[PDB]
Design a binder for these strands. Structure first.
Length: 414
RNA sequence: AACGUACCUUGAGCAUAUAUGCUGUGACCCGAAAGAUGGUGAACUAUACUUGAUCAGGUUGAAGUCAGGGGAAACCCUGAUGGAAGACCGAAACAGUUCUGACGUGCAAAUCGAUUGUCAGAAUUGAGUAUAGGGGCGAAAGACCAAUCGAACCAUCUAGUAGCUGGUUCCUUCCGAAGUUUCCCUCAGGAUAGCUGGUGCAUUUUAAUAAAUAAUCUUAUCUGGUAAAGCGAAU
RNA sequence: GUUACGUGCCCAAAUUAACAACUCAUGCAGAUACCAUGAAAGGCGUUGGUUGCUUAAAACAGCAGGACGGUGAUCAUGGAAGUCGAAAUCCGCUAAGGAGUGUGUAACAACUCACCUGCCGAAGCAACUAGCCCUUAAAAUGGAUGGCGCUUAAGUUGUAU
RNA sequence: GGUAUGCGUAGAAGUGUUUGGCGUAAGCCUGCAUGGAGCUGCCAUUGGUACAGAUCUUGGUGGAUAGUAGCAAAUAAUCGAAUGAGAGCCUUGGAGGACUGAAGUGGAGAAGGGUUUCGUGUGAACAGUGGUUGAUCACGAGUUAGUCGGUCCUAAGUUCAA
RNA sequence: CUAGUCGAUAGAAUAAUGUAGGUAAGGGAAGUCGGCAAAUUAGAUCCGUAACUUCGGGAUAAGGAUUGGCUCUGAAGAUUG
RNA sequence: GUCUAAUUAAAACAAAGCAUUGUGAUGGCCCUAGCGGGUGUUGACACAAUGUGAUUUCUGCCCAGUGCUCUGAAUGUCAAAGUGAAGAAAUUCAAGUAAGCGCGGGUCAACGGCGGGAGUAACUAUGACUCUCUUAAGGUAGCCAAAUGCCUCGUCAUCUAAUUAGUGACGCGCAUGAAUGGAUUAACGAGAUUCCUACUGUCCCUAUCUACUAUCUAGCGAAACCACAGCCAAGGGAACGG
RNA sequence: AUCUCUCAAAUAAUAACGGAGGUGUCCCAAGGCCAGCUCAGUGCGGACAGAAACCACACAUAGAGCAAAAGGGCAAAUGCUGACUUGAUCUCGGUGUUCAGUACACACAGGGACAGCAAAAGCUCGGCCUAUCGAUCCUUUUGGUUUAAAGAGUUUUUAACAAGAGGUGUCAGAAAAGUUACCAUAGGGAUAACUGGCUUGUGGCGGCCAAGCGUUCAUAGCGACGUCGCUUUUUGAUCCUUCGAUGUCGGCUCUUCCUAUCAUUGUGAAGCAAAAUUCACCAAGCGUUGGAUUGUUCACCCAUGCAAGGGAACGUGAGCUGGGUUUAGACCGUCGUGAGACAGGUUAGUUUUACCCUACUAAUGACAAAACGUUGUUGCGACAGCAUUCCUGCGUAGUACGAGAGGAACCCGCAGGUACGGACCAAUGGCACAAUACUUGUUCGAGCGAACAGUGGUAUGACGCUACGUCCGUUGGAUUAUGCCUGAACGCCUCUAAGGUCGUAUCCGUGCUGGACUGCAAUGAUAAAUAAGGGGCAAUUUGCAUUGUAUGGCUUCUAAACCAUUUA
RNA sequence: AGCAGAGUGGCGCAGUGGAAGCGUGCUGGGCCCAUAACUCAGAGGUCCGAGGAUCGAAACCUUGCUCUGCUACCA
RNA sequence: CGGUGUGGCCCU
């Protein structure tokens, strides 16, 4: 009569949770797969934006399952991302109190749309950074500054990370400012990274050398937030019965009598969502590269794989809702990328040692549903729309007056 | 000459001032449920009376009457016409049920909002008039009698009593207890001795510039059945 | 100026120009009377003992030889013949071989013990008694020698100054 | 009541005090600053005599808040013009949206109110917000009868000639 | 419509919980003290009506069908015959 | 139809009906400090006082205890005045001696009552029976684990996937019962007690949307309450601290 | 009130609703006192003669009697018997134990008298001593032959003094029946129901020795007869705190901790073949349910489960609920004559305030402080939290194994699934752009609307938001339980005596979420104006002025060593 | 826990210190054509157990055993 | 004019 009498779950796993609105809007990488050699000598992570979910058809190559050699429709998430710019390289050393940051010099030519993370009122600004520090590539520079410090990366340093832009200007968004992110090189024999990084300043980096077909990846970013929701939903605690003046929808018993306190674990009224989140080992499906300028028009293999062969793009008709003009190159990953609309989402490499079968299975995909989401799928492409539907008293049928006036245009000159 | 005496055995009281108590009225202080003598109000409400007044539209067909039809008579038989009953569902009139929902420092010293019952009579009601504080009145609950009802309401005899609780106001110096026996319709209190404090007063070669005492051991002398024993004594 | 509790340190005073031994703890080893704990019963855990034996005619441990017949006389036939269990009952043999020690051996047997001697040659062994540790000994908020802590002690004991 | 040829508008009582001091202590003495008319010391007496308290009486005043609680029922107000020191109102008048629905938030009667009805004029409390108008004040007027009605008659009943 | 009112502190603002008005795919009392808040039913015509009855009921039993708008015919009267 | 107005609307109340009870006027019931009033503008088919409760259907036995009246045959009590005797007298007794209570009946639709013991049937079990005990007379006709049976979560079918319940029937019934009223009851309930039919966010389990609040801002602006007061553990304590 | 025996620790005194009891009487002899004469028993006896009578004789230290309870005394008595008599008398005052050294009462020694027995001396002022009992007011006798009646007689009455008696057993003395669930008050923890608290007969709870059982076999598992021990869930105990109020029983929601462990991980035991199951050590990490009646904890079902364990601040009413219970209505059965109780049954009933301060979820943040600025961006982790879970099938195979029957769902791999956990929305489910189409009622004269019915009702309905859908949820390092490793003091062995190792959902760490609220790291910018200033470079070149430190020139120092795994 | 108590012939009861009391059964005969009824006759008692006191106890006393009554709390 | 019940089952 005084001990629970039906033991049960609790709700809301107290590990994650002092559950506050995060200390960072960026994607804090939190860690990297440690220091491995004969491994991805190149980068550890990448900078991605979120722009919707687009419905992939495929099948797997399982052992004797119940869908084995039988085709399915599993959801995908587009974490679109343009290439980035590397402009500096930070070295590190080791204390018994932590991993102290020692040396980085930035490259001499920052991007103007990445010269904004340092200011805050840029319309008011006189645009005076980097004035002083960038002219350190104009002096003697090596006997005093750079090869001194590069030797300090050579002699002293062990863990080198490099810094990275996010070329936001190639996605038309209402944000219009960069996102500086650290990225760690992960080879061995540190001077090979110094030879790597000193040639990788002021150069672009696209996802091709960073990622490929059928890799695992981790979606470290912010979540969509909510705001101050309640007590009944904010950890999924049940309804008290109907009769409750003082609440159909609150949590009853907060402590016992003794001791004379209130713990932090009790179901409390506390801010919902907008935490930091990451779940790990999300599986890549498709990488593509579809802007322009290869021979002529390029947009192909995005709306298609080799069983539909119809080009248009991974764009919907009228684009992803609240997000959607995928101009750039992009990746295609799995069920629920985290974070709301238009986000900033970081993606570091995986950490487990996969003996699970359902990580390594290489398969193509079969069909990308290129429909809207602002409606429902009744067609596929607006190019295909004139196959079913014929004349339409609109631009389909208004253009016959634009034809007789074009016929009157030759009658105008003659 | 035996014994009782508040008795004289050469006198000591009064007159007041002071201080401490004990006692009698306001009896250190305020305090209670109630008892009394007088007047008081039916202006909600119990309630009869008088005289006024109002309470929509709707379904169910009571006697009585009405020919058609059967049959020997008694007459049985559908059809209507007829609008009666403390009859029904419902509205302003009223009531107040379940939600135990809305405020519970209200809209309020009892109301609002959903819901539910009667609704042509034991009905509903404006005015006039009766009924009175240990009684009026009560289709009966000790309901109601002016926000009070197992006795109101307002001034007194009323600073009514309390073994029962609260507070019982300036400083230092000196001294420093009780919680026990008895008695008592006492067992939460009082008297009673006990302890304490005060007031001096008589005096020691134990009081004034011992050969006399009162308290602890000795010395000596009586005093008890508890340990320890004791069952090869009683019981 | 100096004392009836106590000095590693918060704590004022010794980690004493005072030591002899004590006690190893794997989930509270213990720590200053009342006082805020621990019993019944063990220990090839240790350290002190009392009483028994036995050994230099060399013991223990340790590896060598024998181990039955008179007699299957006999008790026991689910076997008794040495042997589930035996009334009995000696001896012969011999340094040492017993109507017998034997694996829930039903017969004969097989068979090693006891025993004596080889072998090694200074201590060994039986119960007994009682210091600490040791098992005992299980509570709900997480925290108690009073905390920090200690271990040829700051510890449980007798004590010097 | 006796007393000190007692100080007192050339500042007497209390009130403050970072002036100074006496007692073991209660308490005084003292300097300055208010203040404006009366006061204390010795010794005899003495009364309704000193307060932290009484769920103490009365009168200010806190924190919470002096800006939190909450002013959430009755469909719901709106631009433009005034005027005004200043207008979401009310204060109007111009539009024009919706309510009250004739068992009304409409027009006039009873009991009770008692000058509220009306014009004129307005500053502050009054109208749990404002305020130029108000059921507040200021200041003026305002209710006409033979027929409307009290008046007569009597009803239950006041017990009301001796 | 007729009469009269905007009089209930205001411009703003999409948090909980509460305050009242709701719908929610499956099953449908398991829920909880309990079928209580809440849902279906609701008007009228046409049938169709069970046991028990004091033969007045129970009776709206239950159990059902039917029900717009628009275009028409059929019927129920009065005066002068 | 009525009531607890402000927590009890119902199983309390209220009937209609039915059997009683006093009274023929000098009256019965009754207010009355006293004089005169109410019942009563009246008169047993009227008044007064009751217990019940439509009706349908039957009113079980008992007058001991007290309540009660009596056309009540009454030496056993019994008061003053008044009458007798003694006594100088206050006083002492005598003869007396009415109503009451006791005494004699009548009565329960007046309160309230309405037992156990052994034995006993060609199995057992029983008890149709037989004996005895004792009372004012022994619970009768019907009901029932009833709204009322401690033992209780009774014993038995059924409703149920599985039911301390609700129905049925069974009677040793702690303490069932005939107007302190018994047993059936048709019509209605803001009545309780359970299983179907319909059913729906009651729930499995929350999903969301509109109405004004908070909230935030401009005016407005208080109240209870408060030793000063706020970081917990273990130990002490007046024994669950700040 | 009152009496004894102890309780009482050797004077006395004395406790509780401690133990054993007793008393409200009884006796003209059971009194007073002289006289004779000794019983309890038991032996041998004796017509009828035993347990039977009555006589006789011995032993008779009291083993009896003494009115009564129990103690004490008691031997030519204090008993048996006998004689004879009223001292169970009048009187005066003191003294004993009750204690205040009171009163009553009861005993005791006198002085005086009058006697009574005995020859005398003596003995006697009631029972052999510890009980065998009462104060005023009056009523009332007995009384001197007594005074008073207030002017004086006489006579009767009352009145008084003195001894008793009628009487007060709640025993120092009122005359005395009930209940209030309509109840109103002074108060009390001096005194309970509830919550805590020490205690544990009660019960859950283990230990030990083995009488036996277990076919044999005491000890696999068991363990009787008896032996001794912890917990606080109840069950009483007790009265320590709150009576000027601690809102007291259940379920719901909900954090938590707890081992005496149900089942899951790692073993070991067996009468452990296997399957199955039992024992026992370590182990709190997730798990321990959906329902019928009841108001429940338990109880008992039905079912899932390859499987359903106990417990904590009476957890919790400013979170509810109010079904019981513990007010006011109301019926019933008995018990009381009744108003009226019923740890028995029915039904009906207001369940209140938070804005205070910490506590806690989320919200922003300052002067200052500091190996220093105003302000960036990008970093590090001390630090605190810590969550994934267990089943299932198919292989493994009818294989091993087992005589077979049965059966390793063995190790692992594969597929899946449960619960929570973290999230998103493409599709599908929900809710509605109250946008739009059909639409009733009324006004807008008629034709558009959605004009208004506080959202008219209806159907579809995109953004979102959401669950019923979706995608996900992991790896390092020690080391208990344990097996072994080598090895002696203990010549042998031997898992320890020190030593190297195999190992768990446990615990620690990565892994994931907040971060000395404002700790920390490098790193960017560094001003108005460029007339004039501002700000650095400055630790400085340049004086005045101040602090600090070696204070008598030095109570300075110096920042360069003692392995480079590890040892009395 | 006081207390109302009771326990007697096979069974039922009556019995207040001098007795073993009544009735029904049970037992025998007569009566009967045979069984019942009828008639005569006989038989039937640690008086619940252990004690108390005494001239004697079923009764008087308390004490235990059996058994109702009868309401009360809560090692 | 007083009372008076009962007779195990089957035998040309």
């Amino acid at each position: 009569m005084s001990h629970r009498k039906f033991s049960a779950p609790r709700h809301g796993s107290m590990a994650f949770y002092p559950k506050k609105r995060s200390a960072r809007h960026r994607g804090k990488v939190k860690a990297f797969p440690k220091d491995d050699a004969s491994k991805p000598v190149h980068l550890t992570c990448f900078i991605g934006y979120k722009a919707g979910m687009t419905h992939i058809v495929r099948e797997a190559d399982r052992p004797g399952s119940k869908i084995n050699k039988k085709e399915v429709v599993e959801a995908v998430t587009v974490l679109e991302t343009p290439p980035m710019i590397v402009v500096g390289a930070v070295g590190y050393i080791e204390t018994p109190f932590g991993l102290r940051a020692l040396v980085n010099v930035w490259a001499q030519h920052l991007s103007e749309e990445c010269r904004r993370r340092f200011y805050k009122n840029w319309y008011k600004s006189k645009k005076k950074a980097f004035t002083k520090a960038s002219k350190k590539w104009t002096d003697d520079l090596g006997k005093k500054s750079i090869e001194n410090d590069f030797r300090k990366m050579l002699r002293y340093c062990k863990v080198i990370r490099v810094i990275a832009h996010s070329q936001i200007r190639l996605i038309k968004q209402r944000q219009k400012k960069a996102h500086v992110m650290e990225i760690q090189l992960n080879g061995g024999s540190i001077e090979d990274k110094v030879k790597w990084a000193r040639e990788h300043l002021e150069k672009p980096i696209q996802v091709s050398n960073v990622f490929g077909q059928d890799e695992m990846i981790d979606c470290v970013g912010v979540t969509k937030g909510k705001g101050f929701k309640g007590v009944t939903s904010r950890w999924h605690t049940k309804k008290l019965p109907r009769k409750t003046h003082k609440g159909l929808r609150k949590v009853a018993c907060i402590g016992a009598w003794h001791p004379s306190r209130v713990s932090t674990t009790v179901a409390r009224a506390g801010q919902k969502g907008y935490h930091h989140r990451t779940e790990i080992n999300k599986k890549i499906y498709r990488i593509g590269a579809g802007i322009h300028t290869k021979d002529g028009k390029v947009i192909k293999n995005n709306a298609s794989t080799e069983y539909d062969l119809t080009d248009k793009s991974i764009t919907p008709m009228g684009g992803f809702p609240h997000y959607g003009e995928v101009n750039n190159d992009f990746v295609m990953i799995k069920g629920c990328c985290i974070g709301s609309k238009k986000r900033i989402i970081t993606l570091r490499k995986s950490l487990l040692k996969h003996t699970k079968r359902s990580a390594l299975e290489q398969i193509k995909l079969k069909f990308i549903d290129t429909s809207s989401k602002m409606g429902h799928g009744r067609f596929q492409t607006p190019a295909d729309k004139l196959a079913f539907m014929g004349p339409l008293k609109k631009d389909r049928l208004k253009e016959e007056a634009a034809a007789t006036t074009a016929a009157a245009a030759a009658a105008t000159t003659t």
